[PDB]
Swiss-Prot record, chain A:
The keyword Nuclease does not apply. Belongs to the bacterial ribosomal protein bL34 family. The lineage of its organism: Bacteria, Bacillati, Mycoplasmatota, Mycoplasmoidales, Mycoplasmoidaceae. Pfam families: Ribosomal_L34 (PF00468). The gene is rpmH. GO terms for biological process: translation. Keywords: Ribonucleoprotein, Ribosomal protein. Transmembrane segments: none annotated. HAMAP family: Ribosomal_bL34. InterPro entries: Ribosomal_bL34, Ribosomal_bL34_CS. NCBIfam families: rpmH_bact. PANTHER family: LARGE RIBOSOMAL SUBUNIT PROTEIN BL34M, MITOCHONDRIAL RIBOSOMAL PROTEIN 34 FAMILY MEMBER. GO terms for molecular function: structural constituent of ribosome. Signal peptide: none annotated. This is Large ribosomal subunit protein bL34.
From Swiss-Prot, chain B:
Belongs to the universal ribosomal protein uL23 family. One of the early assembly proteins it binds 23S rRNA. One of the proteins that surrounds the polypeptide exit tunnel on the outside of the ribosome. Forms the main docking site for trigger factor binding to the ribosome. This is Large ribosomal subunit protein uL23. It comes from Mycoplasma pneumoniae (strain ATCC 29342 / M129 / Subtype 1) (Mycoplasmoides pneumoniae). Part of the 50S ribosomal subunit. Contacts protein L29, and trigger factor when it is bound to the ribosome. Coiled coil: none annotated. The lineage of its organism: Bacteria, Bacillati, Mycoplasmatota, Mycoplasmoidales, Mycoplasmoidaceae. Residues 1-92 are annotated as: Large ribosomal subunit protein uL23.
Swiss-Prot record, chain C:
PROSITE patterns: RIBOSOMAL_L17. Transmembrane segments: none annotated. One of its GO terms (biological process) is translation. The lineage of its organism: Bacteria, Bacillati, Mycoplasmatota, Mycoplasmoidales, Mycoplasmoidaceae. Belongs to the bacterial ribosomal protein bL17 family. One of its GO terms (cellular component) is cytosolic large ribosomal subunit. This is Large ribosomal subunit protein bL17. It comes from Mycoplasma pneumoniae (strain ATCC 29342 / M129 / Subtype 1) (Mycoplasmoides pneumoniae). Pfam families: Ribosomal_L17 (PF01196). The gene is rplQ.
UniProtKB/Swiss-Prot annotation, chain D:
The keyword Ribonucleoprotein applies. GO terms for biological process: cytoplasmic translation. Part of the 50S ribosomal subunit. Forms a bridge to the 30S subunit in the 70S ribosome. This is Large ribosomal subunit protein uL2. It comes from Mycoplasma pneumoniae (strain ATCC 29342 / M129 / Subtype 1) (Mycoplasmoides pneumoniae). Keywords: Ribonucleoprotein, Ribosomal protein, RNA-binding, rRNA-binding. The keyword Lipoprotein does not apply. Belongs to the universal ribosomal protein uL2 family. It comes from the Bacteria. One of the primary rRNA binding proteins. Required for association of the 30S and 50S subunits to form the 70S ribosome, for tRNA binding and peptide bond formation. It has been suggested to have peptidyltransferase activity; this is somewhat controversial. Makes several contacts with the 16S rRNA in the 70S ribosome. PANTHER family: LARGE RIBOSOMAL SUBUNIT PROTEIN UL2M, RIBOSOMAL PROTEIN L2. Gene3D superfamilies: 2.30.30.30, Nucleic acid-binding proteins, Ribosomal protein L2, domain 3. GO terms for cellular component: large ribosomal subunit.
Length: 47, 92, 119, 285
RNA sequence: AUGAGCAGGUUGAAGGUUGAGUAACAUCAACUGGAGGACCGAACCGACUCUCGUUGAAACGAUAGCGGAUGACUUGUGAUU
RNA sequence: UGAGUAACGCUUGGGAGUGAGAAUCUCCCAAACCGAUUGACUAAGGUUUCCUGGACCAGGGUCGUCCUUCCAGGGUUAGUCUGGACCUAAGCUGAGGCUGAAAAGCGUAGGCGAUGGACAACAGGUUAAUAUUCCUGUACUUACAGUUAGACUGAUGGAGUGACAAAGAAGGUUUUCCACCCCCAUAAUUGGAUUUGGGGAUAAAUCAUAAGGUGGUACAAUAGGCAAAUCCGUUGUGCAUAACAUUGAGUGAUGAUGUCGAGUGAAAGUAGCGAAGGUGGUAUUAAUCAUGCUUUCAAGAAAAGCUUCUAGGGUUAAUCUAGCUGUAACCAGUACCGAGAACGAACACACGUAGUCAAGGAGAGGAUCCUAAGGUUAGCGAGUGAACUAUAGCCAAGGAACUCUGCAAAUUAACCCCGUAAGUUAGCGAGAAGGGGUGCUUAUGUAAAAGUAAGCCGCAGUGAAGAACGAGGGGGGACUGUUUAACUAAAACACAACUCUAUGCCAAACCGUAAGGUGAUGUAUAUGGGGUGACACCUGCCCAGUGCUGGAAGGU
């Protein structure tokens, strides 16, 4: 059966890309505090 | 040429099969940023020999050591395979 | 009762016994299930008895219970049968073969029977 | 004229007709000349905001804009010859391709009665009157069918340029300005004489005799199907939602917005043209 | 916006053509004709009936089907709320 | 703990060996299904899962010597394929720039943006992993620089092109099909017999013939296209009778003495070998011509790219064409799985999963039953075959007595031929109703058949396969349709249609705070609102009051 999530990695990059998240101030601040949050992955490119 | 991009040749069974032919195909691991223009240049300047033909590929990194206590990731490397004129080769 | 292994009826046991009699005629030995051996002994005795008249009617008849392999063809089996098997076992009123009880298998720990025929 | 639609369908009955498109038009096959056509994109009902900002509209079949002269002053005193009558699927009428005698082909709005090959002339100077003439109001007497009127002079005719629309002059303001016009839908203004006009009636007058027929045909022609307000959700509209045909309880009913909008006019009472009010669609002043 | 597809075989209306025919009409004969939120009907869509699954093949479906099935088309890609 | 309770998640048997030990490892044999797939292509997806060897310690719904399990090593090659370098569709960003406590929102030039366009290769070969990539042979393009000759070139801007729907029809064209020919193999131990099966050709690329199509070919003034114009234009004239230009199947010559082959088959069925490589049409087929053609209305893309004219200039050749020569053609991808144990699904599950060829008997079929290569026995087996249950196959006779009810279940079916009414908006009804037929041998029958006649046969003849059940009365809605995803499918909703209402252009309305935008590039015959909601005839009254609108005195 068709499911809720598709592994379309290009649409994945568009939806949750690093360059997309640095184009928004909220995303930039989130990545800053996630650097402060000890997370290994911040975006898809920083996995 | 930085005289470092010619990292190392490898001799595997498929490489042995390639070299036991007539055009003396060899393989060099190289920096994946260079174009075949300057790669071929580095080759005709390191010796007197110009490559008959050039081909490029990369060994895509995979999860090395598989499922184990200490897994990891494999290395990044680009293999350039060179065919030479039939009667000539390189003595590495 | 939707799609699954549905179990086996008379057709499957018929094809199984035909394959088994062809296989025993290939060599002269089968190790199988005791129930199938008991089922096959009757047909084997009848087939040994049925091929002793040797005409085209009996040719088709005893041909109707043989299957093929590479070492032997169904034609090869009927030829071998008619050539040598029938004249030898005429000296007994039944009981051509012997089915003996072996030990259990390692696959299912079930009673395996060996069916054989010698003279 | 129109003709009954022949389909012989066995799913219900269709009581619809269709315009002939040949005794009023030409080339009933969409592949016209490549002179003055520009591709159009519909908004899908959305604003520039991305939000849907029109009601029950969406699903129009793709149509291409025909580049039509509206200012009609760049080519003045140059004689035009009607070369074709080509349909305009965007507007409610059919445009006409003409050729100014200097050698300039152009699409224009086609007034009623003009045909391919007719010879006309339009400029900014007082001349005689023939169908298709366009010439400023200051040189025209009252009592003529005029359309494509320009509230902002030198811009282009905007009012009364739909299917079979025009206006009649009910006199001229006795101060040498503001020619009095009877706008369609019953309005009557004292319109600026600084402006131009297109004489006669506009073609394609049978939009009073159009048949829509079914749902999806109109959906492809535009407007989407939707429910009335009084069957909407009880929060989005209190009259709807539930069992038993809950009818409208508000005298002068409203919209999703609390609009007491029955009979009340929403024309500005203090515009610079409010001193030019003569008649609003029912009465005087 | 960009695209793909709609097995199959179906109907012969309109239109137009020819002729008879009427002052002209009208009327009809035959011909081309191939329109259809037309037909059934593969695929396909939906979940309308039945059974099963009732801690499953399935955080929810599987059978026979049913209705619809060149359009109030489906579907794919991208955008978009 | 339940409890050994349940289950072990789409399909075998035998022989032989390995291994101490094998249903599950392998070889063989068969099977029966899928067969428009249970055959291969690839998009996307997974991205080493792909290959070799060793091994089975953590998983294999037990087993497991083995696994898609682990360990060690290894596999994907691109001047022409996909794509960057060609560009754009929606769309996005967007400096400067408009609005907004600010962050920010909006927004132009532009720049990003294929699922499209510009665009130069094909085939065989060969590994344990691939191969327009590697090789082999047969070709093509693109500039660069020099050279040979000719030769004027001309964008920034102008013109054209690209540039385009669905539905439908009948042809050209060669295939297809069949008869028949060649070649190869084949010769029958059962009754009978001189049988049976298969093959029969080749790409890019160049050249020639190009079927046919598409529908105008030249003279000049320019008052039109920011300009300038030799380019479109504009004007008629000459031809308008067929040229003119474009295109265009196919066919032939190479390519191609090449691969290859029926088949043969030595060390394995591997290598070698490899015969033939033919005609007629076709009332069967698609393909291409073909952006062809016809019709309809809801009217069906751009940029890139191409051509061209003038400016722009050059005219000691800047410069173009082509020959020849040389130089060189860059960046990235390439494994396999790929409808599914490698996507998702937490999943070794049976589900939904891009497009696409998709063969035979046989049929209208891509429907159906049985098949050609294919691949395997659905990660648990083996026995007896209790009740009880799922699945069925069946039950003689009544036959609706069952029920809240013909709910459910069960007669009709495919093809062919007769005949069909009420109502009816003339379209239906309708496969109404109601009946008959389906086989074979011979002849007749068109091109084969239909069809007919004679005979013969069956227990009956789409003999297996899968095939609308009707009739009438009633309610609603006309209808066709959307509809409460994982309870209700409607008589709910929608819809055509209608009365009223508002919106006159910088339209109102809506959004934001705003700019501003949709509205709308709409213009009353347009849009919105409110409700009524096939078709038809009508919708009567009441303004007490609320409200809607309007008004102007008077009070306020």
């Amino acid at each position: 059966m068709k499911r809720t999530y598709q592994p379309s990695k290009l649409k994945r990059a568009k939806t949750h890309g690093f360059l997309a998240r640095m184009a928004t101030a909220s995303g930039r601040k989130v990545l800053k505090l996630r650097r402060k949050k000890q997370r290994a992955q911040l975006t898809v490119s920083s996995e | 040429d930085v005289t470092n991009v010619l990292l190392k040749p490898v001799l595997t069974e498929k490489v042995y099969f390639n070299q036991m032919g007539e055009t003396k195909k060899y393989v060099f691991v190289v920096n994946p940023k260079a174009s075949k223009t300057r790669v071929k240049l580095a080759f005709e300047l390191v010796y007197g020999i110009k490559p008959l033909k050039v081909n490029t590929l990369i060994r895509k990194p995979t999860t090395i050591r598989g499922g184990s206590r200490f897994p990891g990731l494999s290395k990044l490397e680009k293999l350039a395979v060179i065919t030479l004129p039939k009667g000539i080769a390189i003595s590495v | 009762s939707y799609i699954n292994k549905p179990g086996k009826t008379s057709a499957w046991r018929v094809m199984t016994v035909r394959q088994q009699v062809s296989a025993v005629l290939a060599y002269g030995k089968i190790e199988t299930t005791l129930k199938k051996a008991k089922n096959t002994q009757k047909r084997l005795d009848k087939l040994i008895t049925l091929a002793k008249v040797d005409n085209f009617n009996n040719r088709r008849q005893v041909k109707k219970w043989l299957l093929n392999t590479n070492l032997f063809d169904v034609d090869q089996l009927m030829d071998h049968l008619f050539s040598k098997v029938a004249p030898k076992y005429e000296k007994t009123p039944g009981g051509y073969s012997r089915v003996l009880k072996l030990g259990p298998r390692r696959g299912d720990a079930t009673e395996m029977a060996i069916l054989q025929l010698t003279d | 004229p129109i003709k009954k639609i022949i389909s012989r369908s066995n799913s219900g009955i269709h009581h619809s007709t269709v315009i002939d498109y040949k005794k009023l038009l030409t080339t009933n096959k969409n592949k016209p000349e490549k002179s003055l056509l520009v591709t159009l994109k519909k908004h899908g009902g959305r604003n520039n905001q991305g939000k849907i900002t029109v009601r029950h509209q969406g699903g129009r079949n793709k149509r291409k804009y025909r580049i039509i002269d509206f200012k009609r002053t760049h080519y003045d005193n140059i004689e035009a010859t009607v070369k074709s009558i080509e349909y305009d699927p965007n507007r409610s009428c059919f445009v006409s391709l003409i050729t100014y005698a200097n050698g300039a082909k152009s699409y224009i709005i086609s007034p009623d009665g003009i045909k391919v090959g007719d010879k006309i002339l339009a400029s900014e100077h007082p001349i005689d009157i023939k169908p298709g003439f366009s010439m400023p109001l200051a040189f025209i007497p009252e009592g003529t069918q005029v359309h494509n009127i320009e509230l902002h002079p030198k811009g282009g005719g905007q009012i009364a340029r739909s299917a079979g629309s025009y206006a009649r002059i009910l006199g001229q303001d006795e101060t040498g300005k503001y020619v009095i016009l009877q706008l369609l839908s019953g309005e009557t203004r004292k319109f600026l004489k600084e402006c131009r006009a297109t004489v006669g009636v506009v073609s394609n007058l049978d939009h009073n005799l159009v048949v829509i027929g079914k749902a999806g045909r109109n959906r492809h022609r535009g407007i989407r199907p939707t429910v009335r307000g009084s069957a909407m959700n009880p929060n989005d509209h209190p009259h709807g939602g539930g069992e038993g045909r809950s009818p409208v309880g508000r005298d002068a009913p409203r919209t999703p917005w609390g609009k007491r909008h029955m009979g009340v006019k929403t024309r500005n009472m203090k515009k610079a043209s409010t001193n030019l009010i003569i008649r609003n669609r029912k009465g005087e002043q």
